[PDB]
From Swiss-Prot:
<dbReference type="GO" id="GO:0070301">
    <property type="term" value="P:cellular response to hydrogen peroxide"/>
</dbReference>
<dbReference type="GO" id="GO:0005782">
    <property type="term" value="C:peroxisomal matrix"/>
</dbReference>
<feature type="modified residue" description="Phosphoserine">
    <location>
        <position position="11"/>
    </location>
</feature>
<keyword id="KW-0597">Phosphoprotein</keyword>
<dbReference type="GO" id="GO:0070062">
    <property type="term" value="C:extracellular exosome"/>
</dbReference>
<dbReference type="InterPro" id="IPR012674">
    <property type="entry name" value="Calycin"/>
</dbReference>
<protein>
    <recommendedName>
        <fullName>Fatty acid-binding protein, liver</fullName>
    </recommendedName>
</protein>
<dbReference type="GO" id="GO:0015908">
    <property type="term" value="P:fatty acid transport"/>
</dbReference>
<comment type="similarity">
    <text>Belongs to the calycin superfamily. Fatty-acid binding protein (FABP) family.</text>
</comment>
<dbReference type="InterPro" id="IPR031259">
    <property type="entry name" value="ILBP"/>
</dbReference>
<dbReference type="GO" id="GO:0071456">
    <property type="term" value="P:cellular response to hypoxia"/>
</dbReference>
<dbReference type="GO" id="GO:1990748">
    <property type="term" value="P:cellular detoxification"/>
</dbReference>
<feature type="modified residue" description="Phosphoserine">
    <location>
        <position position="39"/>
    </location>
</feature>
<dbReference type="Pfam" id="PF14651">
    <property type="entry name" value="Lipocalin_7"/>
</dbReference>
<dbReference type="GO" id="GO:0005654">
    <property type="term" value="C:nucleoplasm"/>
</dbReference>
<feature type="modified residue" description="N6-succinyllysine">
    <location>
        <position position="31"/>
    </location>
</feature>
<keyword id="KW-0813">Transport</keyword>
Amino acid sequence: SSFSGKYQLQSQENFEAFMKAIGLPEELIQKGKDIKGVSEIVQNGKHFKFTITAGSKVIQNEFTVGEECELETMTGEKVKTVVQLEGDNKLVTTFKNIKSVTELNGDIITNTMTLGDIVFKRISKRIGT
Ligand SMILES: CCCCCCCCCCCCCCCC(=O)O
Ligand SMILES: CCCCCCCCCCCCCCCC(=O)O
């Protein structure tokens, strides 16, 4: 249950450039750019459930570490891939050429998505339970 909990985005780098690159409609870009979104994670051993909420836009996902999963991405595209643990605090995966590192240190979750030379970084803090 190491990863479990509720977090809000504090700050992000390269939101707009990244979203344009992956094909997010310009409308949801302009609205979603200042939203401090909420991610809820439930871990049970290798099995994870996670929800990303950005006012009205709810994305529900699930994966088991080491197994095939189908991840619903920000556009609505679902891609088959695998999520692995790196070290004690990292969830690592690749989907549609985007490299994704999810790093937890105490109460701060750091997510970095890299597509070619574009690095999309989000910092989020724990907000209760
Ligand atoms: C009212 C609709 C909400 C606005 C549109 C949502 C646009 C996306 C906002 C950023 C969400 C974060 C996506 C990356 C999070 C992650 O997968 O780690
Ligand atoms: C947008 C496509 C899904 C992103 C791939 C993430 C899969 C493993 C990580 C699960 C927990 C995500 C927590 C990140 C915190 C945040 O929202 O910034």
